[PDB]
């Protein structure tokens, strides 16, 4: 959803803790899109 001021210059350890403060644990739109593509493109026919 939101982002710190300069995310590109924040180390990924630190970016993780800022997101953690407002994060429900739910996968969100971008992760869910990439997992749908992984399964639909790399799993054998019928393996949903």
């Amino acid at each position: 959803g939101t982002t710190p001021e300069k995310p590109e210059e924040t180390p990924l350890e630190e970016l993780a803790e800022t997101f953690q403060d407002t994060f429900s644990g739910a996968l969100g739109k971008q992760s869910s899109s990439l997992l749908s593509r992984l399964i639909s493109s790399k799993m054998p026919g019928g393996f949903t």
């Binding site: 993780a16 953690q20 429900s24 644990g25 996968l27």
Partner: peptide, 7 residues
Amino acid sequence: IADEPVK
């Protein structure tokens, strides 16, 4: 077994 949301 115990559940944990993803970090």
